[PDB]
Amino acid sequence: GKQLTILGSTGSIGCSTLDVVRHNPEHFRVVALVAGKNVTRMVEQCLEFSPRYAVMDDEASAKLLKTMLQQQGSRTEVLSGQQAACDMAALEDVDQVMAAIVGAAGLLPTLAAIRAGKTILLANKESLVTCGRLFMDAVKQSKAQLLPVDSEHNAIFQSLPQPIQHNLGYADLEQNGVVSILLTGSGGPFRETPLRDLATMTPDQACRHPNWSMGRKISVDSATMMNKGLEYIEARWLFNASASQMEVLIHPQSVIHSMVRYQDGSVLAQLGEPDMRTPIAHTMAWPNRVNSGVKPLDFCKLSALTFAAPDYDRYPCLKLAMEAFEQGQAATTALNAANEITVAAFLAQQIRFTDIAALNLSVLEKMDMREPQCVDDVLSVDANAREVARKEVMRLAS
Amino acid sequence: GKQLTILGSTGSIGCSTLDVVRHNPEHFRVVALVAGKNVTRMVEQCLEFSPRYAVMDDEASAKLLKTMLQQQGSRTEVLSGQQAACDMAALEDVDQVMAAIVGAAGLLPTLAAIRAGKTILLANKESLVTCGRLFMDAVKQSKAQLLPVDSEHNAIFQSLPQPIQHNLGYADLEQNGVVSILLTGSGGPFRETPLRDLATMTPDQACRHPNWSMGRKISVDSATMMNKGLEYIEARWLFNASASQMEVLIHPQSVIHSMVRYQDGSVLAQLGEPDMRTPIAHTMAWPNRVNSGVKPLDFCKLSALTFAAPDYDRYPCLKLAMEAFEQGQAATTALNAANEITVAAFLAQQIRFTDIAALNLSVLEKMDMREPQCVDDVLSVDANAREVARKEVMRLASSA
Ligand SMILES: NC(=O)C1=CN([C@@H]2O[C@H](COP(=O)(O)OP(=O)(O)OC[C@H]3O[C@@H](n4cnc5c(N)ncnc54)[C@H](OP(=O)(O)O)[C@@H]3O)[C@@H](O)[C@H]2O)C=CC1
Ligand SMILES: NC(=O)C1=CN([C@@H]2O[C@H](COP(=O)(O)OP(=O)(O)OC[C@H]3O[C@@H](n4cnc5c(N)ncnc54)[C@H](OP(=O)(O)O)[C@@H]3O)[C@@H](O)[C@H]2O)C=CC1
Ligand SMILES: O=P(O)(O)Cc1ccc(-c2ccccc2)cn1
Ligand SMILES: O=P(O)(O)Cc1ccc(-c2ccccc2)cn1
């Protein structure tokens, strides 16, 4: 079947990927698993999927893993550190690399897979949010096939014509009859909150998305629409879309995952149950399909589907992201880094809900760095933006 | 430059297709126009599009047209009759044939295109409602490309993978990751009417689709969901779908035109403004795209989108169509034919709204014909079913 390396196997996307393989043991062979510190989950995955290699970024973790796998009678070879992670991404015999490491740490292993011309199941945000120019250049250079895993981008990918799907990132949209890309977002828990009350929203209220339940960081990003802002940045790189070829639409029910508008009037959309196994199984099977374990969407048990235009007075972060894109990878990197700092401060009750957007702006205004030319440059912008952001939080809470 | 024949150029689909040509004069050349009796419309189209040929099915119409064009200095050659219509569909240099003749009259001209291996932009309902097996067998033999123009089928086509699109009729759904085809219908004006009030609904009520504005016959078919039943028949042929691979959903807003359900849980859908130029331009440009004149769908000005399962007590015609399919082309042809007669009788106030389903069933029960083996056989089932249906109407309008 297809030989796969899973980068970030022990996290949420990694576990969902392995559930797809579990459903399709004849179509997929796990060659390598890479993770950080979750030795316990990693052991269980090595014992189920029999990979050739298992890598832990953390050395103490790698040593403990080796001792457990030995105790358990497994001969999976245990490696450690960043170079081994990149090596697994570049293994000559692997076909697909699930790029699911979180944060800047996913950058070099992902680039290693790109440079190796692998099919990349891309689920690491920083890759296009921070390194969109560098990675799209590298993809063109190696002819690597990117298959986006995030629900929105995968929905768009499924709704795009074949010549774009092949050649993803270099194809011309207009030449292929595409007018625009329609990014849909829930609008978050404060979609209908009076604007006066936004300054007093609590972390528990912000993380209380009506319908979904997910991590606190992403819940807050959904409340600010920073999440859609970051997906805007990725979509422009992934789909070769100009600002006029992008539309953002609030869709509270999140049944339509995103859409593509065509020259003749047609709009194609992908819909489905809210379950990451669907987009993951799509990318793993492309251009064919596999069972993912996700149940068929029941159209008779849906809330009525509604749409609205995002109000930038309600979602300044969405506008900030759009503007940042225009300023370049230094601005997008700085925004993403600043946002991690301000959201964490919000969750720690150091700042108010509305201070997230205000301090994100403040960081971008204060900085002005030059366009990154390599991953080290991006890492540098990221580090500097966090420091500026932390000082801003301290001043404010000071 | 794609060379085309337009069968039924003077009708609604015909006019919409020439608007697409008008918007894209450098991508499409009109070689031949074919119609029935609308000499006036035909004259204008010939002056504007300069086809090599124009045919009218009606002989006097063809004669009237021949002179007017010679007068206005048109170089188009005017022919007449069905054989001429079929020859246009088979012209060696023609790339695409827009199959937009209404009724049993569209069968032989559409078939001529299929036998010629043409790309067919299929609009004519009778082609697959009555000759589904014959026509799909024919397209498989000549490797003709079918491109469905009807909104539902076109939406499904656009939501299907490339291996199915390019082998439409022959490809296996399952092997291509497709679990089912989701056909959406508005549910008509009586979607929420008390069942016991259906018997008293008037033609004007049935034809007053709250949200849509179309011909009287189609409006009644929308009210009974016979329209969806006919499309179910077409879809099973066109997409090679078994009964378990078909779903019918009521979607009152008709924004989603139909959908395709995949193995991984994904559902692909096509949405757009309710303008036939969209699906027409889709088929004309496929696998590429062209401007159609249709404005982008404004998602901020929509009614909330809803869905529901059809209740067969409310829509017995839908269920009759599904059952007819299982009995073969003799049954689907008889149902289509009986429904023409019973809808016309309802509209003429000879029978009740609810007598349409009742009499359609009664015709089907009285018919006992073999599977048709060629178009002529289908025409005979049609002729016979019409007469059975007329007598049922008269029995009901006269006696008990
Ligand atoms: N969750 C979702 O619905 C979606 C998430 N995304 C993106 O996908 C990526 C992964 O998300 P998710 O799976 O939710 O995140 P998780 O935090 O659940 O998992 C992250 C994975 O990365 C591993 N990891 C962390 N640091 C390193 C490192 N230095 N080297 C190697 N592995 C490391 C973790 O290992 P361990 O736990 O063992 O320490 C874990 O396996 C993120 O970038 C996220 O933004 C995109 C689309 C959808
Ligand atoms: N209207 C719609 O939105 C849709 C319609 N369809 C189907 O497409 C087909 C065409 O529909 P529509 O355009 O609305 O129908 P119309 O009634 O508007 O047009 C019918 C066309 O066929 C011509 N015609 C009739 N008899 C003959 C004949 N014997 N030989 C040659 N031409 C003939 C008419 O010519 P003339 O007027 O000159 O006499 C006219 O050009 C129908 O089967 C319909 O069910 C499918 C999907 C959508
Ligand atoms: O689209 P966003 O807002 O960035 C994140 C998000 C939030 C909610 C949902 C959602 C999922 C299921 C039901 C209702 C809402 C999906 N994604
Ligand atoms: O799907 P049906 O019911 O057979 C025909 C039909 C009726 C109404 C509509 C419709 C179109 C636009 C707005 C509201 C309803 C579309 N098609």
Which stretches within A250-296 are classed as H helix? 277-285
Closest CA to B182 of B245, B227, B274, B128: B245
For residues B192-222, one letter each, b for 16 or more C-beta atoms within 10 angstroms of the residue's C-beta and e for the rest, the string is ebeeeebeebebeebbebeeeeeeebbbbbb
Ligand 3 cavity residues, CB under 6 Å: A 185-186, 188, 209, 211-212, 222, 227-228, 254, 274
Q: Three-state SS string across chain B, please?
A: CEEEEEECCCCHHHHHHHHHHHHCCCCEEEEEEEECCCHHHHHHHHHHHCCCEEEECCHHHHHHHHHHHHHCCCCCEEEECHHHHHHHHCCCCCCEEEECCCCHHHHHHHHHHHHCCCEEEECCCHHHHHHHHHHHHHHHHHCCEEEECCHHHHHHHHCCCHHHHCCCCCCCCHHHCEEEEEEEECCCCCCCCCHHHHHHCCHHHHCCCCCCCCCHHHHHHHHHCHHHHHHHHHHHHHCCCCHHHEEEEECCCCCEEEEEEECCCCEEEEECCCCCHHHHHHHHHCCCCCCCCCCCCCHHHCCCECCECCCCCCCHHHHHHHHHHHHCHHHHHHHHHHHHHHHHHHHCCCCCCCHHHHHHHHHHHHCCCCCCCCHHHHHHHHHHHHHHHHHHHHHHHHCC
Contact between A81 and A54 under an 8 Å Cβ cutoff? The reply is no
List all residues of chain B from 67 to 86 with a beta carbon under 8 Å from chain A: none
Tokens at B369, concatenated: 């014909």
Which residues, in sequence order, are bridge partners of residue B185? B250
Q: What is the CA radius of gyration of chain B?
A: 21
Element (H, E) at A363: helix A353-367
CA B99/CA B89 separation, integer angstroms: 9
Task: Identify which ligand lies nearest to the alpha carbon of A183.
Answer: 3
As to burial, measured by CB atoms within 10 angstroms (0-12 exposed, 13-18 middle, 19+ buried), residue A230 is: buried
- Tell whether A151 lies on the interface with B, counting CB pairs under 8 A: no
Distance CA B366, CA B381 (A): 12
- Sheet with B96-99: list strands edge to edge: B77-80, B53-56, B28-35, B2-7, B96-99, B119-122, B145-148
DSSP code, position A305:
B
Mutate which of B160, B178, B264 to disrupt the A interface (most A C-beta within 10 Å)?
B264
A282–B295: do the CB atoms touch at under 8 Å? Answer: no
Does an H or E element contain A355, and which?
Answer: helix A353-367
Give the C-alpha separation, A108 to A329, whole Å.
17
Strand-pair partners of A204: none
Nearest chain B Cα distance for residue A244, angstroms: 14
Please name the residues in contact with A15: beta carbons below 8 A apart, sequence gap of 6 or more.
A9, A41
SS3 A345: helix
Two structure tokens written together for B317: 């015609």
Report phi then psi at B51, rounded to 5.
-70, 150
C-beta separation of A233 from A128 below 8 A: yes
* Domains in chain A, CATH or no CATH each: 1-150 (3.40.50.720), 151-311 (no CATH), 312-398 (1.10.1740.10)
Q: Report d(CA B282, CA B83) in Å as an integer.
A: 29
Give the side-chain half-sphere CA count within 13 A for A279: 26
Provide the shortest C-alpha distance from residue A159 to chain B (in Å): 7
Q: In the 8-state DSSP scheme, what is residue A234?
A: H
Nearest Cα residue to B138 out of B106, B169, B100, B166: B169
Query: DSSP code of A308?
Result: B
Q: How many CA atoms lie within 13 A of B219 on its CB side?
A: 19
What is residue A350's DSSP assignment? S
> Are the CB atoms for B211 and B332 separated by under 8 Å?
no
List, edge to edge, every strand of the sheet that includes A119-122. Answer: A77-80, A53-56, A28-35, A2-7, A96-99, A119-122, A145-148
Interface of A with B in 278-337 (CB under 8 A): 278, 281-282, 285, 287-292, 294-297, 299-300, 302, 304-309
Q: Is A179 on the interface with B (CB under 8 A)?
A: yes
Length of chain A as a residue count: 398
Task: Find the radius of gyration of the CA atoms of chain A.
Answer: 21
Ligand nearest to the CA of B62: 2
Query: Are A92 and A2 a contacting pair, CB within 8 Å?
Result: no
Residue A249 DSSP label: E
Q: Is B212 in the pocket of ligand 4 (CB under 6 A)?
A: yes
First to last CA, chain A: 58
Q: A161, B287: Cβ pair inside 8 Å? A: yes
Query: Residue A89, Cα to own-chain centre: how many angstroms?
Result: 18
Tokens of B323: 């059952």
First to last CA, chain B: 61
Find the ligand nearest to B125 CA.
2
Q: Which helix (H) or strand (E) holds A56?
A: strand A53-56
Q: Which two tokens stand for residue B352?
A: 């009740």
Alpha-carbon span A85 to A104, nearest angstrom: 14
Q: Is A167 left (phi over 0), alpha (psi -120 to 50) or beta?
A: left
Euclidean distance between CA atoms A194 and B271, whole angstroms: 33
CB-CB neighbours of A273 under 10 Å: 16
Q: Are B126 and B381 in contact (CB under 8 A)?
A: no
Ligand 1 centroid – CA A89 distance (Å)? 15
Structure tokens at B214: 């179309």
Q: Is A175 helix (H, G, I), strand (E, B) or coil?
A: helix
Decide: A354 and A116 in contact? Cβ < 8 Å. Answer: no
Contact state of B285 with A177 under an 8 Å Cβ cutoff: yes
H runs (alpha helix) in A24-106: 39-49, 59-71, 82-89
Interface contact A305-B305, CB threshold 8 A: yes
Distance CA B137, CA B257 (A): 27
Asked if A249 lies within 8 A of B177 by C-beta distance, the reply is no
Residues 223-262 of B with CB under 8 A from A: 249, 259, 261-262
Q: Give per-residue burial for B367-388: e unless 16+ CB within 10 Å, then b.
A: bebeebeebebbbebbebbbeb
Resolution at which this structure was determined, Å: 2.0
Element (H, E) at A120: strand A119-122
Q: How far is the CA of B116 from the centre of ligand 4 (A)?
A: 34
In angstroms, rounded to a whole number, what is the distance separating the alpha carbons of residues B46 and B75? 9
